[PDB]
Amino acid sequence: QLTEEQIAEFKEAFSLFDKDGDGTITTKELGTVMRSLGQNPTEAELQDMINEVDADGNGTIDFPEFLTMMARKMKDTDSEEEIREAFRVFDKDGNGYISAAELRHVMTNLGEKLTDEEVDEMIREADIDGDGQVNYEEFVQM
Amino acid sequence: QLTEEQIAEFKEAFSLFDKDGDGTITTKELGTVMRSLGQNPTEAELQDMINEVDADGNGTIDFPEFLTMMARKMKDTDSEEEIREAFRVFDKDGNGYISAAELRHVMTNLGEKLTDEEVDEMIREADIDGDGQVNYEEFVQM
Amino acid sequence: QLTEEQIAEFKEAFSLFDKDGDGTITTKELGTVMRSLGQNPTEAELQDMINEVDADGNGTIDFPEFLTMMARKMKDTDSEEEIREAFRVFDKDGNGYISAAELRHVMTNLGEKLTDEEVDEMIREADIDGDGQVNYEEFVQM
Amino acid sequence: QLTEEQIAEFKEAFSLFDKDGDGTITTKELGTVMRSLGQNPTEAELQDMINEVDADGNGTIDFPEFLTMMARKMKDTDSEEEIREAFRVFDKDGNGYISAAELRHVMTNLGEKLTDEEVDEMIREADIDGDGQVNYEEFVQM
Amino acid sequence: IGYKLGHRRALFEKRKRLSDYALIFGMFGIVVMVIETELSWGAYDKASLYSLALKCLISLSTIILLGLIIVYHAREIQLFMVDNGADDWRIAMTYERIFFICLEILVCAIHPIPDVDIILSIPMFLRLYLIARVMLLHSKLFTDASSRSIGALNKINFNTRFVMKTLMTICPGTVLLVFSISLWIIAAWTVRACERYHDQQDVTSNFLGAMWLISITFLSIGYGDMVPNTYCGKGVCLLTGIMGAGCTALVVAVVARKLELTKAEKHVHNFMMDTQLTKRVKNAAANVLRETWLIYKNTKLVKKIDHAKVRKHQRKFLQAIHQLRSVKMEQRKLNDQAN
Amino acid sequence: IGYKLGHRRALFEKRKRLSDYALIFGMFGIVVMVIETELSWGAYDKASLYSLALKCLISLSTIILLGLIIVYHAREIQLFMVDNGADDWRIAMTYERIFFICLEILVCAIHPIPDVDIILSIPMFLRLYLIARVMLLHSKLFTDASSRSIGALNKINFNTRFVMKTLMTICPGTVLLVFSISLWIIAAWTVRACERYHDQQDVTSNFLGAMWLISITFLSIGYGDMVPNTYCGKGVCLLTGIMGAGCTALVVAVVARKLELTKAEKHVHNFMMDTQLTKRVKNAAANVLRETWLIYKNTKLVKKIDHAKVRKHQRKFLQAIHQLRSVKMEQRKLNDQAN
Amino acid sequence: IGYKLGHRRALFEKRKRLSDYALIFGMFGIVVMVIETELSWGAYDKASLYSLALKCLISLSTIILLGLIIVYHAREIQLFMVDNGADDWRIAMTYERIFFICLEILVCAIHPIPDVDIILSIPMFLRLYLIARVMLLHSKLFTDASSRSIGALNKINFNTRFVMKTLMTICPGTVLLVFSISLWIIAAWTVRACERYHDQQDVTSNFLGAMWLISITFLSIGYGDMVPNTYCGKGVCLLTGIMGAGCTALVVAVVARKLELTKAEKHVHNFMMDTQLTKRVKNAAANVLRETWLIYKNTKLVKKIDHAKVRKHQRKFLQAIHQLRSVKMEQRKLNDQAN
Amino acid sequence: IGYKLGHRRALFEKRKRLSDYALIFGMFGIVVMVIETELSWGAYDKASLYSLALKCLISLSTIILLGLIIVYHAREIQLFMVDNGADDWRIAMTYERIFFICLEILVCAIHPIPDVDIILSIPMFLRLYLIARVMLLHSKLFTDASSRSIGALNKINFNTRFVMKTLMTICPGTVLLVFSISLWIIAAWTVRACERYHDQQDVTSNFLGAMWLISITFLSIGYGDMVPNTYCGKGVCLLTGIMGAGCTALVVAVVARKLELTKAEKHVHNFMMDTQLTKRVKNAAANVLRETWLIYKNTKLVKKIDHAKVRKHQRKFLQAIHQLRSVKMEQRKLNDQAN
Ligand SMILES: [Ca+2]
Ligand SMILES: [Ca+2]
Ligand SMILES: [Ca+2]
Ligand SMILES: [Ca+2]
Ligand SMILES: [Ca+2]
Ligand SMILES: [Ca+2]
Ligand SMILES: [Ca+2]
Ligand SMILES: [Ca+2]
Ligand SMILES: [K+]
Ligand SMILES: [K+]
Ligand SMILES: [K+]
Ligand SMILES: [K+]
């Protein structure tokens, strides 16, 4: 259980993300925090990055909601980064219900290939989204 | 005081700020000088700096009005502008209200360790006005 | 003579020029390709460079049409387009149809120098049909 | 004078900023040749520089006028342009009407500051332009 | 939260002290070896009890260190299992990892066994890599929360090299002075320890006489009065001459950049140079004007004018003309430093 | 079309393979000479059949090399015909080409004939230019079709120097650590091959005694204990100083070029420093305020005015005044690094 | 007000001359020691009255210096009291100040007492810090009003290092030449003062034979002959190698940077090169056109043309083509870079 | 007009030939002095008529040089009177001018009068300043008419500094290679001439024995086998060390700038590196997807699955995870370096 001699660090870390006295994390505050480290993202990208922590949909992040993202501390292993970046590379911008017909082409032409009948089992494993229309879902395997 | 052999230096120093013939210095001269140096200050900052020195409010500073500023020589260890500068860090929304909660927090949470009474007596005393909303005038006892 | 074990570099080069597969290699793709490397040209120059090879006149260069341009392989020291560059250097206004301007002086006073009476023999071919100057045409002998 | 073997140099020097060879130089060509070197003076400054080259006032300069301007041709560092350059430091707002007090102040306060017989002697030999104004014309005696 | 974070920080903290308890018990061995060798070089022989006790204290402090290393590696594997979802200790064993572990044990297992007592003692100056493991753990950049909060946006890596680069950048000069004055007393004991178990006497077998050769070899001078004879000195001279032919340029660059220039205070100096003699062209202008008036005054008046009074003023008039151009050159050149 | 490209590719492949087959039969001729010389230097004499057999293998294997060079040049002329479109082999022979061909044959025709056996042996370290021809044909930059259409809009020439100045940029450091250690065993065999035909002993007649002189001459130290005597050593010690007084100034530049330390992490470091002790202005202000209040509370609100209890606080106030300015100076100075 | 500023200026002026009267009576004590030592080194002995007189003048003139130092410090304290509102000779004595005041008297109190007469005489080359105190007082930057009304808008402090780093900038080269040629006759008298009390001869007891060692050690050459054999030379050589292995990397930068050119005087050169052979492409174009016409005129027009008159033109038509591209490459380079 | 310019050009042309006729009759003296000294050293003595003839040809040919210098100065004065309106030979003789004229005559009027013959001979290597006067007259920049029109709007002065600073820039490297190899045979004859006049027979009495010392002193190596003994070699070694400890740092910059490329050439390389292996993100993604599908297909299906076939694929999955991040780091770094 966390104690009071190791919670001020997290409190001040949260304070860096909220200059004013409100307890709500705003997209404007993230915009101000960014654009000073070097990179300037689109406000749509800000919404995309900010809705990945929000749970109640209010558009603001509380300290308990921010702590579950602070939990993944500095080790840079596994996590939900690669499992989404691989899909983003494979898919297109806003692909959503991708055709997935070229899945065999992507698996064979690029990188090591599997058996011709092996990809049929992988294709048949996407029955969650009806028939076809492969999305970021069905990734509950990992 | 100093004879005419030590007044030409001050005369040319004064003429440095005032290019034109008239012995009146205004916002334009300070703006030109400070922009030539390199910094880019707000016009309101220039108005505040001008209002700091003038004693009649005419908006122009004369040579007798400038001798009191020129009296501030190099004198590295000085105790005139530092007391004024060590107030913006505790400015209360520009007005400089300096509320009791803000003052107590500033005196206790950060700085030098002291007892609760030894850190709250000044706030309890309030020897500036006594009505509340302490302005910048509390430094009169100096 | 070509074989499938070696026809992949041309295909990947074509994919490099044409991002998406739709059969169009028009100004849109070449503009981005050139601007990626710098040296931003005028769109009129893009049209001039894109009509340098064409058979149907549609403004689209197909893979068979692109292969005759890819045939200009290494050992760049050749006799192709150097004549075009020389004519562009020695071009006047928009067509250079003037009566030789100072061609006699150029032939008899530049480099190794030529004969004074040889200018008439050189201009004897002319435009053949009497249409000003060669205009980069009538260069079958050249 | 110099034979034709020493006139092609001057001809090509004239053609350097003549370009089209229309026989007349315009402020457009002067701007084209001047902005290339880096300096960007006002077109009014171009008119001022082009005024003191011709006597007809046609606004264009022929070859003889350019030749008599170039007659300096190095090692001509004398009272030709310095005598005029050492006049803007005491120019009466570009009007050529310097007051006697201003002239006396410039002679006495700044410079050698000669004796009274040589400083107050500005009234001597000041009978040139006895109307009251002192323009650039009195340098004819020099 | 409970088994999330919390326990993780606790395991990290209990791992941290294992790399710190292996520094005392690693430097104690080196200290005892140095003391024992320096005492035995000209004193009690092997039969004395000192050569039996001080040569077993090292053999014990070299067993405790390799006892601690295994536990530290076990804690690292436990952190790997906690951080990355797994429940087997065989998953996290790659060829590289096991090779590095065996190499570490081999390097830390060298110690004289209670002649060859110098051969097995020279390579004990290899436990000096533990300072890196101590330093990468005793740093707030790698041990904080605000650091990771503001550094996760840019996916940088906090290796054992990023900390070193930051320490070089923010505190230069001193990190080179310590490195260049803590290497003399490591590479100058080695030369005498190598030449004393061999052809003796000379002058390299005397401390403060072997700090002269290393100081004139580190520095690229060389004299030739003292040259090593055995292969140990002949091999360490060009290893102290390589690290020192590219370490005397970094410090020179730092000296050149340190307090020999500034950025925001040069504007004041430029303004001062502008208001100085570069704006005293009025002097030359007045000189020219008064000279050209006086020439006319004394050539067209005063009855008959002597040639000397005219030619003196005319010569000084030609003197006072190029001075104006010379000052105007600097006046125009000063504007090139304001870009 | 297809034929006009496939035929050219086939000719290119043949040219490449002939160029590659001349490296084995050129580097086999520099091994047998070394083995034969360093064997005969104190072993089986000329009467032994070895001194004839091994000296005949080199003179035999030097025939295949200059038989291959002519055919490779013939393939080059054929490719010139194909690319340009001429029907005469007399046309494509400029003075420069015919001079270079005979120069190449002369350089590659030097070999000992089955004393002068060192004079005709030292210049055989000249067939090392064939590495350039081998390397410029195995590079995908010069051998591809993707990097020939987009690489032609800039009319860049892919000669034998562009590849070298690209392999000096994308893989630096290693191209110097190979060049600095493949030249020692070329310029240290030469010294002992030159100082044995005329002189003898002189310390520098052993390989490990001649890799010391070159190492302290390459490095700009110089000692003076061993210096060459013949002109061969006295010239190679200078050709190893010229190449090496400007090669140690490149590796230092390369190793210091890592002072850039990226640009996406210096922003994070600057943010860390901004949130660090450069935000103790609050602490300094609190100190100033409390030390101002205490003086009044101690002198006016006390029955007895104690000098020792007021001057202490006042001098500490003077101490606290300048800390605020000293920290605001760094606060202002940190901003220009963000410009 | 007027009285305050005038009194402050008067106090400053009467404080200025104390550090100037402490320079004459400090540099007079370094001349008499040199004269007395280099006279007694082979002349009138201790029994002579000279060794009692000239050794007493120094011990007398060392009283005035430490008498003036106290008064100068008292003037500084008076200025501090006038500046900061306080009426007490105490308070202003901070812990650092009371130590820096005593260190100066300790350093300036060293003098031979009327062998150890060299031990107590070598460290008298420490009163050379007074030059800095004089120079920071005889600078118009620190003593004016324009560069205090306009120099305070950037909050810059005119300490004793800003003046030095400004003199190094506005007058470089000379500040290094004076420093590097006024140190030889300070570090070459020390060597012969150290090597005569213990050793003798060795051509290191002659001044012109000791300005050779420092010159070939400062430059980092070293020869091997004439090397010091005592602990004083063996240390001063190192202290003149360190200061000199990083002082020859600054003057080289200055000589390479000494105003090669600027934009104003390079735009003209760029225009010159643009109008020069970078614009003779007309020559190559005319060559190509004349050649391609002559080919036809000599092939078709001739009733029976020969090969020697048709390929002679072609083999230089191939020469006249790549020249155009070779000049256009330079044209593109000039038009792209060095604008 | 035409006359006012044609006459000036006529005087310029008839003046430029005097500084050219003063070069042959200046270098002929040096050649004859060298030949006469080298002949007299060990051959026909003073009694031979050669020592009276060749020592008189120099004394005769030194008359024409100082006769031509006066006429050249007269032409300069005539030009200075033509261009500026004045008619007097007394005006324009400033203090500097007459001093420079007498200094020139003094320097150019030293020759061995027909021992002291080596004292009065080594300062004859001072007529080498005439090369500058010839070069500033045979330059198109200072003599053409295309300049002075584009070169006058920038007020640039065409003195003897601008030509040198342009020749150092447009043709670097060669201006140092013809300066560092034309100084050896000037500074190595001087040492020989200085040490053959002191009855010395050291090793450095042969030319090839004195081109070794200068080559290992110019180069900052030093051995100590041969060191000069007189006060001439001691000092010319110093003046060849000073000029040469700051001349080897100027050619390294040039070679480093030549071992690089331009932006229009690096754009293609950046594009190639972008399209190269840094596009294996697709490969890594396919590898990760294949591995994560095999894990499920192997552990859930096929009756009962052994642990080995699961842990192998999971370990390879952990291997494949971090390659994607490692290549994304290079992607970001390349994007940052692209601008
Ligand atoms: Ca908020
Ligand atoms: Ca929420
Ligand atoms: Ca005004
Ligand atoms: Ca006022
Ligand atoms: Ca397309
Ligand atoms: Ca088409
Ligand atoms: Ca025109
Ligand atoms: Ca006109
Ligand atoms: K060196
Ligand atoms: K050296
Ligand atoms: K040496
Ligand atoms: K040596």
UniProtKB/Swiss-Prot annotation, chains A, B, C, D:
PROSITE patterns: EF_HAND_1, EF_HAND_2. Ca(2+) 4 binds at D127, D129, D131, Q133, E138. InterPro entries: CALM/Myosin/TropC-like, EF-hand-dom_pair, EF_Hand_1_Ca_BS, EF_hand_dom. GO terms for molecular function: adenylate cyclase activator activity; adenylate cyclase binding; calcium channel inhibitor activity; calcium channel regulator activity; calcium ion binding; calcium-dependent protein binding; nitric-oxide synthase binding; nitric-oxide synthase regulator activity. Residues 5-40, 41-76, 78-113, 114-142 form the EF-hand domain. Ca(2+) 2 binds at D54, D56, N58, T60, E65. This protein has four functional calcium-binding sites. Belongs to the calmodulin family. This is Calmodulin-1.
From Swiss-Prot, chains E, F, G, H:
Keywords: Calmodulin-binding, Cytoplasm, Ion channel, Ion transport, Membrane, Phosphoprotein, Transmembrane, Transmembrane helix, Transport. One of its GO terms (molecular function) is protein domain specific binding. GO terms for cellular component: cell surface; dendritic spine; glutamatergic synapse; membrane; neuronal cell body; plasma membrane; postsynaptic membrane; sarcolemma. It is a multi-pass membrane protein. Changing E260R: Increases inward rectifier potassium channel activity. Does not affect inward rectifier potassium channel activity. Decreases inward rectifier potassium channel activity. Highly increases apparent calcium affinity. GO terms for biological process: membrane repolarization during atrial cardiac muscle cell action potential; modulation of chemical synaptic transmission; positive regulation of potassium ion transport; potassium ion transmembrane transport; potassium ion transport; regulation of neuronal synaptic plasticity; regulation of potassium ion transmembrane transport. Brain. Residues 207-227 dip into the membrane without crossing it. Residues 274-339 are annotated as: Calmodulin-binding. The modification Phosphotyrosine is found at Y44. The keyword Electron transport does not apply. Inhibited by bee venom neurotoxin apamin. Inhibited by UCL 1684 and tetraethylammonium (TEA). Changing K258E: Moderately reduces inward rectifier potassium channel activity. Loss of inward rectifier potassium channel activity. Significantly increases outward single-channel conductance at positive potentials. The keyword Thylakoid does not apply. It catalyses: K(+)(in) = K(+)(out). Belongs to the potassium channel KCNN family. KCa2.2/KCNN2 subfamily. Small conductance calcium-activated potassium channel that mediates the voltage-independent transmembrane transfer of potassium across the cell membrane through a constitutive interaction with calmodulin which binds the intracellular calcium allowing its opening. The current is characterized by a voltage-independent activation, an intracellular calcium concentration increase-dependent activation and a single-channel conductance of about 3 picosiemens. Homodimer. Heteromultimer with KCNN1 and KCNN3. The complex is composed of 4 channel subunits each of which binds to a calmodulin subunit which regulates the channel activity through calcium-binding. Interacts (via N-terminal domain) with MPP2. The calmodulin-binding domain (CaMBD) forms an elongated dimer with a calmodulin molecule bound at each end; each calmodulin wraps around three alpha-helices, two from one CaMBD subunit and one from the other. The coiled-coil domaim mediates heteromeic assembly. This is Small conductance calcium-activated potassium channel protein 2. The lineage of its organism: Eukaryota, Metazoa, Chordata, Craniata, Vertebrata. The chain holds residues 118 to 478 of 580 of the full protein.
